């Protein structure tokens, strides 16, 4: 049951005025595409606080990637769901290397120890989120957000993203035609998508939804990755290829604009982006991965 | 559980191309506003058919308004949820005056006899939908759509409207500023809305949602109307005033554009409307109401 909103004073939405005319703000299956100027965060904060919403955030920091946790967490404290209940779940092979980060009220952090894989693994993250943590998340949070650690928050990332299932537009492909998307193209893979199919290219570094929908997605992707492994094939972009297949066949109920996953070093700051919210931290891929 | 969509071939949505730049297509609380060009009906039909969705439609035809049923139902057969399961519920004081209309497969009609009120009643429709039919609807349909009878369908009205809770933009006020909206303005009424509040002016002739959400809305409006009656006040636009108060405090999850509730005699055919879907049948208000 959703209680009534209180009286609020805010600008009237005008039907004959879009704010955003430069971008698509709704998908053809009537899912909002979240850009700055499309939402009144005061209304959304009211709606979600009235439900006492708890957001879980999963992040993996394996081997050298533990070095990214301090900036990741400290900037999450500044920008991620501030005012709402947040539970961070940090998956690591080195619990003692997790930095002691000071949290705001109503926010908690759990360190979950896992095994480290040598490779660019596809399988652990989808498996961990589904198979091992299923019961935990259902009991503790309403929504799950699953992100990469080699990132920092620079601006607001809030309840505007919350919905049963969301993906995020990959910053390198939002202007690309579907034939150019780097989907898995081999029919022998479970992640296969033909050249005439596809809505968007979603980045594997930021997806989420309700606990139920995220467990469905991660279970499906893990199962599909196991099939590929049994067949001696590894999708071109690993779990991201499978995420893309899933979200093609199970449409997300919101899509996040590239505001929510940006690399400024690589791509600059285009006019279409009014805010850069969650951004890549420069890294040496080869050095840091081995 | 939502099964996978099949392979489909359709035009790729392009992020840097809106189709609609002339109108607001999403509310500030991230609810789609449904206009032609914003949805791919093939994708939506797939989604809703895979859930075997059943839509109930309620319509009241009391006293002289039974004369409107033939055109209403015959045009509903042509345009309303074609291909989906539909259950019409016709509430009338004259069961024998309900026309025998031929229905397509998967569609059924129930005649529900009620008492006729003399007045421009506010109370029967909200009361009937909540208090008397609660159990029936929960067992028989997934969504309820509640409309006026003095109407005809001229174009597609389909699953694009379906959502937990929707209202429809009143065709006379979609371009108006909120101070001009004919909300109830007396603080002594439960429907009161101050001049600095309001998103939209919703028409009482077309609202709906899931059964649960429609029973919540109709219950709340009926209760509020009973309070006003006990206090010797009747809202300026009767159940529409209360509907507007409810949807201010409980934001709808989609909003239908005036495509879905139009009067061509009164308002013509503006450029902003690409389709006229559900339209007023000319009537002599005084003659037909007494
Ligand atoms: C010099 C690197 C050029 C990379 C451009 C394209 O992006 C890559 O797209 C791939 C799919 O085709 C995968 O999503 C990679 O994760 C992504 O690279 C990741 O995300 C990017 C946004 C960058 O942050 C990159 O450093 C990172 O490895
Ligand atoms: C010559 C009549 C001028 C009416 C213009 C405004 O509309 C009225 O707006 C009211 C709220 O302020 C209520 O919603 C009425 O139901 C509506 O009239 C109804 O809907 C309209 C769209 C018309 O179809 C009208 O005939 C009908 O009575
Ligand atoms: O040695 C590693 C490699 C990867 N990761 C995790 O897997 C994510 C995806 O890898 P990466 O960020 O290197 O991929 P990219 O964004 O460069 O494609 C990282 O953010 C980490 O959360 C990790 O913890 N340790
Ligand atoms: O004598 C009446 C008066 C009203 N109605 C029902 O109440 C609705 C609302 O009344 P009306 O359409 O006259 O209001 P308007 O759209 O003109 O404001 C009608 O469509 C009918 O469904 C009815 O059945 N009999
Ligand atoms: Mn990364
Ligand atoms: Mn009417």
């Amino acid at each position: 049951f959703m209680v009534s909103l209180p009286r609020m004073v805010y600008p009237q939405p005008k039907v004959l005025t879009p704010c955003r005319k430069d971008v698509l703000v709704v998908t053809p299956w009537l899912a909002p595409i979240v850009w700055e100027g499309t939402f009144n965060i005061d209304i959304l904060n009211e709606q979600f606080r009235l439900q006492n919403t708890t957001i879980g955030l999963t992040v993996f920091a394996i081997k050298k990637y533990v070095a990214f946790l301090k900036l990741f967490l400290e900037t999450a404290e500044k920008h991620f769901m501030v005012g709402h209940r947040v539970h961070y779940y940090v998956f690591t092979d080195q619990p003692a290397a997790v930095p002691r980060v000071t949290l705001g009220t109503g926010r908690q952090l759990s360190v979950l120890e896992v095994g480290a894989y040598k490779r660019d693994v596809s399988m652990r993250r989808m498996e961990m989120i589904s198979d091992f943590c299923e019961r935990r998340f259902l009991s503790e949070v309403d929504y799950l957000v699953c992100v990469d650690v080699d990132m920092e928050f620079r601006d607001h990332v809030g309840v505007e993203i919350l919905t049963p299932l969301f993906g995020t537009l990959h910053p390198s492909f939002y202007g690309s035609s579907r034939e150019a998307f780097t989907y898995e193209r081999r029919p022998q893979s479970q992640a296969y998508i033909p050249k005439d199919e596809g809505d968007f290219y979603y980045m594997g570094a930021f997806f989420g939804g309700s606990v139920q929908e995220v467990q469905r997605l991660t279970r499906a992707c893990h199962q599909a990755m196991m099939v590929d492994q049994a067949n001696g094939i590894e999708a071109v972009w690993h779990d991201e290829s499978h995420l893309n297949k899933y979200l093609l066949r199970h449409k997300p109920t919101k899509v996040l604009s590239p505001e929510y996953l940006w690399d400024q070093q690589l791509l600059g700051w285009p006019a279409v982006l009014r805010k850069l919210r969650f951004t890549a931290v420069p890294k040496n891929h080869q050095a840091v991965r081995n």
Side-chain angles (χ1 to χ4, degrees), chain A residues 65 125 148-151 203 205 280 283 289:
Chain A
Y65 282 61
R125 292 194 296 178
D148 277 16
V149 76
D150 61 322
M151 303 291 294
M203 189 151 197
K283 64 182 195 290
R289 282 168 183 175

Side-chain angles (χ1 to χ4, degrees), chain A residues 52 54 177 265 283:
Chain A
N52 196 208
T54 302
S177 60
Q265 171 194 223
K283 64 182 195 290

Side-chain angles (χ1 to χ4, degrees), chain A residues 45 48-49 52-59 72-90 101-110 136-137 140-147 153 156-159 161-162:
Chain A
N45 277 333
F48 283 91
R49 276 303 302 148
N52 196 208
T53 301
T54 302
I55 306 93
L57 180 157
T58 67
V59 67
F72 174 91
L73 294 167
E74 288 185 340
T75 62
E77 284 300 301
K78 298 190 99 77
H79 298 296
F80 180 75
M81 306 289 171
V82 174
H84 295 89
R85 298 195 61 184
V86 171
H87 197 144
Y88 303 99
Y89 301 96
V90 175
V101 173
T102 311
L103 308 184
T105 192
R107 307 172 73 97
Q108 66 180 297
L109 185 148
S110 296
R136 174 89 168 253
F137 297 150
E140 291 189 333
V141 308
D142 300 305
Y143 295 91
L144 276 172
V145 175
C146 308
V147 300
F153 294 85
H156 169 100
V157 175
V159 298
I161 76 179
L162 304 175

Side-chain angles (χ1 to χ4, degrees), chain A residues 149-207:
Chain A
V149 76
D150 61 322
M151 303 291 294
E152 58 174 321
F153 294 85
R154 304 195 202 181
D155 209 330
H156 169 100
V157 175
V159 298
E160 72 281 356
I161 76 179
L162 304 175
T163 193
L165 181 63
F166 71 85
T168 301
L169 297 181
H170 192 299
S172 296
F173 301 99
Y174 65 92
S176 299
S177 60
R178 55 157 66 116
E179 62 267 23
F181 292 165
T182 59
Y183 291 152
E184 177 58 59
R185 305 302 191 170
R186 296 170 289 172
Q188 295 74 25
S189 172
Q190 293 317 292
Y192 169 59
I193 302 168
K195 288 269 177 87
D196 53 359
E197 294 180 53
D199 305 307
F200 303 111
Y201 196 81
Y202 303 102
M203 189 151 197
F206 196 166
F207 64 90

